[PDB]
Amino acid sequence: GEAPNQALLRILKETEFKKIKVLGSGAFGTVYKGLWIPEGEKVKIPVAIKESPKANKEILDEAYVMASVDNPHVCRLLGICLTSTVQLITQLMPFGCLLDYVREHKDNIGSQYLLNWCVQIAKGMNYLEDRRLVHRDLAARNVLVKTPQHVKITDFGLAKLLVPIKWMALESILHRIYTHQSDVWSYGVTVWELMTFGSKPYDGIPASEISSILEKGERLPQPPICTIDVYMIMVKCWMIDADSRPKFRELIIEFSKMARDPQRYLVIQGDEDMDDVVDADEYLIP
């Protein structure tokens, strides 16, 4: 009784896009930034392009998920290119991932931005729940920054249609159970990363110890800038009983209320010829 997945997988010609600069390398391969110019369309779209063995098959699983999502707070695929290498093409997020962003700008991030990011990540996660998708790797390193006002969830390699130990619910560490409510646990840790301006959770504690610590009842500490109102929401995401944790739709509501009066809730010290360039969010295909 599942609905047909009528997402469209677009195949792009290598001549349609121009790589400009490398952004990073590693195990997966090399991520470039460039411009995509569709065939005869009078537009230039800034893009990230992610360029030998069965690794072939999880890049395609990631393409499958990214083609099946459409929401302002989730990164979606523009297409794939089947050259000698398989390339994934997506909207360029020029400010990088949110974890590095908060680390590089600790002294310039006010309460309004922090709480707005919390609302947007919950919106993206609630949409994934609507689509019955469990992310399984939510973390601040997996949130990309389009502008400082607009972030999007990314990295769907581990997503399933219903290990990073320090972001995992207890029931996933113990029994490899993953639900939308185990995603809520990881949302709590991601919020903790933002509120501590990018600190490492359980810094210095070996991952083999996390299950015992969590079972004895310990959790991440209250960040200095957080009122008890914000910290209590994080703690609720870390309940042992998964069904007593908040729903993403409720996390949207709670952080939205706090975003209307941000300083009551976070206490922060001092708180090119691009003529036919179009952002991918304004490039809509039927």
Ligand SMILES: CCC(=O)Nc1ccc(OC)c(Nc2cc(-c3[nH]c(SC)nc3-c3ccc(F)cc3)ccn2)c1
């Ligand atoms: C390691 C974390 C990281 O990438 N930070 C970072 C730093 C600087 C940047 O400069 C603009 C960007 N921009 C950026 C990066 C990606 C990105 N990244 C990575 S990494 C494995 N795959 C992709 C990616 C994923 C799917 C695609 F179909 C195409 C690309 C997507 C969009 N935009 C990102």
